C-alpha cells in the first residue's frame, strides 16, 4: 500500500536499490524505477528512463526533471535514492519542483562519502544533500563516521546494512563446474582491479599460502590494475594457477564451489560480496578495515587482519584449509550471522518502517 | 574452436550481439565482450571492459585501446562488431595496432546508416569503417540499399537477418497474468516513444479499432513523445484503455498474452520486435518501410499499409480480431515462417561459417 | 558599488554577458565571472573557473557548487546568469546552498527558449528556473512571447535588447584589406552554417543578386550545412565569387568593409549581427521573423521579408545596390537607429537599475 | 608557400600551437586550424571547427573526420598537432583516410607524456600515434628522456623549445597599475593551483622572505586546491599580503610591474611561464625539475632548488631582492638568454625546416 520510486546505478548500490525495490514489490507496494539504463516481469514495477538530449548533456537536471513528472504523476509517497552525488541533490530539485508534496530518502553508500566527500568542489554538495533529505541513512557505522568527519551534515544518520537474496545464494555445491574449468582448495576474490582494493596482496598472500597447499585462485573482475596483476601471478609462477575470469556477474556459482574469499582493501563501508560469500557458507577473511569489522567477527565467521600483512593473511588460511573441524565450523557460523542480522526479509522491513515512519 | 571478440551497446544491436555471443559460446567457441556496460555463468565467456579518466573521456580511442590488448593477450582470431560508428573505427585502430593479425567483421543495423550515415561529419567516417573491415553485413536487404545510398562504400555487404532465442519466445499464455493486469481482445506495441515510431497513429488506429471490437492497448516503452501521447489517450478517451507500461525489459510475457502486435513507423531496418512477436504467434500489422516488408508477408503472417494510414490499420484489425478462423492461421503461419528463414541456431550458422570464411 | 557575479558560455549569450560585465567593471562595480573556459586587464574582474573530477562529469552540480562558494565567499549582492538551462537552476540551488542571501538575475535568450523550451524533458526544469529567479529579462519581445507560449511560466519577464561594444565597431573602412583578399559590391552574412540559418537561401539570392551586379559573397562562420553549401555554390558556378572565411572572430573589420548584410534564418530572436552589421553603418536584409522586425524597420533601416523569397531578396538588393543615394541615407540612418535604442551604455544602465532595484 | 594544419586546445600547447600558427601565417603560409573551440584577422588563417551530435559523443572520431576533409579538400601539404592525446592518433585516422597523401608533425608536451603515458590503458595507444607521425618533436630534453622511458617508443623524437611573442612581453613597467592593486617588492606565481604545483610552498616560502622584506605575492590563477592555500595565507598571518588575482589571462602586464617568480612544481617540462617572465626581465627561482634547468641558469638568468625547500627559497630570495646590482644584472642576463635561445622567429624556424624537410 505504498508508491516507491528508486534511483540507483543498476555498483553496489544497483544491487541493492534493485533488489530493495524488487522486495519491496513482493510486499505488494508499487515500486517506479526512475533511472536511465537497465535494471520474470511484475505487474507492480514500472521503469521510467531519463531520456537527454549546450556544452555536456544535462543528465543531472534530466534526472531532476524526471522525478519531478514521475513524482507528481504517479502520486509517489516516497523517494528512495541511493548514492548521494547526483541523486540527493536531484531529489531535493525534483522535491521543491513539486511543492514538496513528497518524502525524500537517502541511502548512503561507499564512495559518495568516502571519496567524493573528499573533494572540496562537491563537499558543501553533499552535505546539502544529506541535510535537505528527510530521512538518511548508512550502511555501516562506520559510513556514518566518515560522514561525520569529511562532510559534516546537520542530520541524522541511521544505520541499515545491506542485504543479500538468499534465493539466489545457498550452499549449493558445483562439483560439476569445478571439472568444467578444470580443478582437482579454492579461493575466490572478487573487485573492480583498483588499487584501493590492493589485488597484488591478495596475489603475493597466495604465493605464500599456495607453498604449503594445493590450491587455485579465482581472481573474478577487470580493472585498471588487471595488467600488473597479471604481470605479477606471471613472474611469480604461479601463472597456472590463478583463473582470471574476468568480469563475472552471477558469481553465486563461482562462490559456492569455493572455499575460502580474500578481501584485504585499503578501505570498504561494506560490502556485500562478504554478505554473498558467507552467504554461501565460505569464510572469508578479510583486512580490518572500517565496515569489513561489522560483519566478520573474527574467528567466529571468519578473520581480520592488518593491510599489507600478506605473510599474515596466508598463515592465517593455511591454516584454516587443512583444519577441516574448524572450516566446517566457520562456514556454518558465518552463514547463519548472516541469516541473523542481515537477513534480507528483516533489511527490507527497516526500510519499509523508515518509509511509513517518515509520514 | 575459435576466438572470437563482441563489441555492441548491451539498443536493437546489444540484443542481436549478446545473443550471437551467448550461442556462439555454447557451440564450444571462445567469446570475448569487450565493452563498457553490463550484457547463469559460461566458463568459455569472459567479459572486458573499457575503463576510462582533457575536454572529453576518450572512450573511442579507449575501446580501441582494449580491442588491441584483448585481441594480442587472447589470441583472438575474429572481431566482431555491431554499430558502425563508432566500433568499425575503432576495430580498424586495433587491428592497426595489432599488425593486422586479426579480422574485423563489422554488422549494421539501423540508425548507424540510416541517421548517422545522413550526417557529413560522419559520412566519410562510416565509409572508411565499412571499407576497411574484412567483412560487413546488414540485417536487412533495405538496408544494404540504404547503405550504398548514403555512404557509397566500395565494399560489399552480405545480408544476415537477426534472431531471436526461441528458448525465451513461446506460445506460452499468461491468462492468469491478464488477471493482475485487470483485463476481460490485446493489442500490444513496442517502441522507444521517439517521432520515428510514430505511436500517435498507433492511438489513433486504436481509438477507432476500440469503437467496433473492445480491447485494450499495452504502450510498451518510454520515449521524448511519451508526454504527446499520454495528453492524446487522454482528450481521445481511450485513456482507461491504454495500459502505458513503461519501458519493460522481459517483454517475453507480454506478447504471449496479446494478440495483435503494432508497428507503424516511417522506418525501420528490421525490427525484431517483430520477430519476437511473430515468434510468440502474434500477428503483426506494419508500415510497408523498408525492411518490415522482408518479415512481414501480408496475409500470410501479418498485414501491411502506408504510414499515416491509422483509418486502414483500425479495419484491418477490426476485421482480424473476430474472424477467429484467419486469427488462428495466421498467428500459426507467421510463427512458423519465423522458425523458417529467423531461426536462431540456422543464423548463427551463417555468422559461423562467415568467420571460417574470412580465414 | 556592487558585487556581481556573471555566468555564461564566453555563443550569443557569451559576448553580451563578457561585455556587460566588462562595461560594468568600469563603471566601478566589482565583477566575478564563474564560468569554466576563457572569456587588457581589470582590477575589479575576477575570474572563478569550475573544475571538475560517476556516469557524466558534474559540471552542472559543480557549477552550482561554485557559484555558492564564491556567493558568500566574496559575498556577493546580484548573481547575473546567462543561458536558462542550466544556469538558471544551477543559481536557484547555489542561492538555496548560501541561505539565499543573493538576488538571481536570469537573461533569457534564443535557444534556451526556443529549442530546450520545447523538450518535454526540460520544459517544467526551465519554467521552474524562470519561476524561481528574483528578476527575469530577455532580449527581446519576441522571445517574451515564446517564453509565455512553450514554458508558460507565473512570472514576469522584462525585456532588455543586446548591446554592441561602439569602440569595437565604427564605419571605418578596410579599403587596403578588399586588395588583400583580392578585390574591386560586397555582401556579408554570417552564421553558424546550420539548417535554421537557411543559408542555401542566402546564395539562392546572391546568385540571382549576382546576374544584375558585379558582386562578391563573404560567407563568415563554419558549421554543418558547410559542404551542403559548398557543393551549391559550386554546381551554381558562382564558385570563384563566394569566400568561405571559416569561422572568424574579430569580424568587425569584415563588416566594415561590406555593403550588404543578408540574414535570411526561420528564426531568431535577435540577434546581434545585424546590430553589428547596422552599426558598421551596413543596411541589413533580414527575414521577417520574430526578432529582427524589432531591429530592422523596413526601409528606414533596412529590409525585411518572408522566409524563402530567394527572388524577393535578390531584388530588394539589386536595387540598393546601385541607388547610391537610398544605400548612404540607409547606412546612415541604421547605425543611427542603433545609437537610438541599443547605445551600449544605455542598456547596460537598465541592467543596472535592475540590480539596484532587485535589493 | 606552404599550406599547414594545426591542431591543439586553445593549456599551454594552445598558446604555443596558436601562436606558431600565427607566426607563420605572417610568414605567407596558409594556415587552417583544426580545432572545436576558440583560438586581428588574417585572411591566409582559416578556423575550421569540429561539430559533433550513442554512448559518448565522438569527439576523436569526429576529429579525425574534419581534419580528413580539411586536408584533401584545401590539399594540405603539413598536419601539425599538438597533444598527443588525442590528436596523433586522429592525425593517423586522417592520414590513412586521404590515402596518405599529407605530412604529420607530433610535437608532445607536458601531460601528455608525463601523466598520460604513466596510465597502461594508452600507453599503446601514445607509442602507436608517436611511431607513426612523421616527424615528432618534444619541448624539452627532459620530456624526450621521459618519453623514451614510459612510452619506449621506436621513432626519434627532436628538440624544439616553445617561444613567446616579444610583440607581447616587453620590460614596460606597470608602475601606474601596482597603485590600482593597492602595493607600494613584488613576487608573482601563475599556476593552475593544481597538487603538483606546490603552491604551498610558494607560500611558505613566501611567509618566510617576507618576514625580512616587505613583499606583497600575486597568486595567479585558479584550481582545485585553492581554498587550502587560501587556507594556509589565512591561518598564516600574511593574508593581506597575498592578492589572490583568480586566473587571469593578459598575464604580460602583471609580470611586468613584478621582481620575482616563483615555480616550485614536483614536475615540469617546461614551461613557459618562465619565459614569460623572464622575457619581461624578471628573474625566477624554480625547483630542479626535469626541464626547468633548461631555461633557468642558475645565477646567471634565476636560481634552481630542490622540491619542498620552503627555506633554501625563501633565503635565495631574500638575497637576491636587496642587493639591486645583482637582481638588475640577473633580470638583465634573463631577459638576454632568453632572446638567445627561445628567440620566437628563430623557433619558428625550426619548425618551419621541420616541414620542408619532412617532404
Given at each position: 500500500?505504498?508508491?516507491?520510486?528508486?534511483?540507483?546505478?543498476?555498483?553496489?548500490?544497483?544491487?541493492?536499490?534493485?533488489?530493495?525495490?524488487?522486495?519491496?514489490?513482493?510486499?505488494?507496494?508499487?515500486?517506479?524505477?526512475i533511472?536511465?539504463?537497465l535494471?520474470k516481469?511484475?505487474?507492480?514495477?514500472?521503469?521510467?528512463?531519463?531520456?537527454?538530449?549546450?556544452?555536456?548533456?544535462?543528465?543531472?537536471?534530466?534526472?531532476?526533471?524526471?522525478?519531478?513528472?514521475?513524482?507528481?504523476?504517479?502520486?509517489?509517497?516516497?523517494?528512495?535514492?541511493?548514492?548521494?552525488?547526483?541523486?540527493?541533490?536531484?531529489?531535493?530539485?525534483?522535491?521543491?519542483?513539486?511543492?514538496?508534496?513528497?518524502?525524500?530518502?537517502?541511502?548512503?553508500?561507499?564512495?559518495?562519502?568516502?571519496?567524493?566527500?573528499?573533494?572540496?568542489?562537491?563537499?558543501?554538495?553533499?552535505?546539502?544533500?544529506?541535510?535537505?533529505?528527510?530521512?538518511?541513512?548508512?550502511?555501516?557505522?562506520?559510513?556514518?563516521?566518515?560522514?561525520?568527519?569529511?562532510?559534516?551534515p546537520?542530520?541524522?544518520?541511521?544505520?541499515?546494512?545491506?542485504?543479500?537474496?538468499?534465493?539466489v545464494?545457498?550452499?549449493?555445491?558445483?562439483?560439476?563446474?569445478?571439472?568444467?574449468?578444470?580443478?582437482?582448495?579454492?579461493?575466490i576474490?572478487?573487485?573492480?582491479?583498483?588499487?584501493?582494493?590492493?589485488?597484488?596482496?591478495?596475489?603475493?598472500?597466495?604465493?605464500?599460502?599456495?607453498?604449503?597447499?594445493?590450491?587455485?585462485?579465482?581472481?573474478?573482475?577487470?580493472?585498471?590494475?588487471?595488467?600488473?596483476?597479471?604481470?605479477?601471478?606471471?613472474?611469480?609462477?604461479?601463472?597456472?594457477?590463478?583463473?582470471?575470469?574476468?568480469?563475472?556477474?552471477?558469481?553465486?556459482?563461482?562462490?559456492?564451489?569455493?572455499?575460502?574469499?580474500l578481501?584485504?582493501?585499503?578501505?570498504?563501508?561494506?560490502?556485500?560480496?562478504?554478505?554473498?560469500?558467507?552467504?554461501?557458507?565460505?569464510?572469508?577473511?578479510?583486512?580490518?578495515?572500517?565496515?569489513?569489522?561489522?560483519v566478520?567477527?573474527?574467528?567466529?565467521?571468519?578473520?581480520?587482519?592488518?593491510?599489507?600483512?600478506?605473510?599474515?593473511?596466508?598463515?592465517?588460511?593455511?591454516?584454516?584449509?587443512?583444519?577441516?573441524?574448524?572450516?566446517?565450523?566457520?562456514?556454518?557460523?558465518?552463514?547463519?550471522?548472516?541469516?541473523?542480522?542481515f537477513?534480507?526479509?528483516?533489511?527490507?522491513?527497516?526500510?519499509?518502517?523508515?518509509?511509513?515512519?517518515?509520514?
Amino acid at each position: 500500500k505504498l508508491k516507491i520510486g528508486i534511483t540507483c546505478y543498476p555498483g553496489g548500490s544497483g544491487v541493492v536499490g534493485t533488489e530493495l525495490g524488487k522486495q519491496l514489490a513482493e510486499r505488494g507496494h508499487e515500486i517506479h524505477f526512475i533511472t536511465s539504463g537497465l535494471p520474470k516481469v511484475y505487474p507492480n514495477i514500472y521503469f521510467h528512463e531519463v531520456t537527454v538530449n549546450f556544452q555536456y548533456p544535462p543528465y543531472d537536471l534530466a534526472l531532476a526533471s524526471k522525478m519531478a513528472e514521475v513524482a507528481q504523476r504517479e502520486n509517489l509517497d516516497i523517494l528512495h535514492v541511493h548514492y548521494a552525488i547526483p541523486h540527493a541533490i536531484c531529489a531535493y530539485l525534483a522535491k521543491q519542483m513539486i511543492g514538496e508534496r513528497i518524502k525524500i530518502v537517502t541511502t548512503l553508500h561507499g564512495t559518495d562519502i568516502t571519496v567524493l566527500g573528499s573533494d572540496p568542489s562537491l563537499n558543501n554538495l553533499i552535505r546539502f544533500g544529506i541535510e535537505q533529505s528527510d530521512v538518511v541513512t548508512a550502511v555501516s557505522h562506520s559510513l556514518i563516521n566518515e560522514t561525520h568527519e569529511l562532510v559534516k551534515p546537520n542530520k541524522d544518520i541511521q544505520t541499515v546494512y545491506n542485504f543479500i537474496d538468499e534465493r539466489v545464494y545457498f550452499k549449493r555445491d558445483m562439483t560439476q563446474l569445478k571439472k568444467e574449468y578444470g580443478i582437482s582448495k579454492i579461493l575466490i576474490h572478487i573487485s573492480n582491479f583498483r588499487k584501493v582494493k590492493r589485488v597484488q596482496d591478495v596475489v603475493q598472500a597466495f604465493a605464500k599460502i599456495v607453498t604449503e597447499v594445493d590450491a587455485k585462485l579465482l581472481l573474478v573482475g577487470d580493472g585498471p590494475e588487471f595488467c600488473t596483476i597479471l604481470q605479477l601471478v606471471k613472474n611469480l609462477h604461479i601463472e597456472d594457477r590463478v583463473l582470471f575470469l574476468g568480469k563475472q556477474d552471477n558469481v553465486a556459482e563461482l562462490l559456492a564451489m569455493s572455499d575460502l574469499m580474500l578481501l584485504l582493501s585499503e578501505k570498504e563501508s561494506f560490502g556485500l560480496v562478504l554478505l554473498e560469500a558467507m552467504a554461501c557458507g565460505v569464510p572469508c577473511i578479510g583486512t580490518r578495515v572500517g565496515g569489513i569489522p561489522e560483519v566478520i567477527q573474527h574467528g567466529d565467521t571468519g578473520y581480520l587482519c592488518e593491510v599489507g600483512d600478506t605473510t599474515g593473511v596466508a598463515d592465517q588460511a593455511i591454516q584454516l584449509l587443512k583444519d577441516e573441524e574448524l572450516h566446517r565450523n566457520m562456514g556454518e557460523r558465518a552463514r547463519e550471522s548472516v541469516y541473523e542480522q542481515f537477513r534480507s526479509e528483516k533489511i527490507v522491513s527497516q526500510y519499509e518502517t523508515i518509509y511509513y515512519d517518515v509520514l
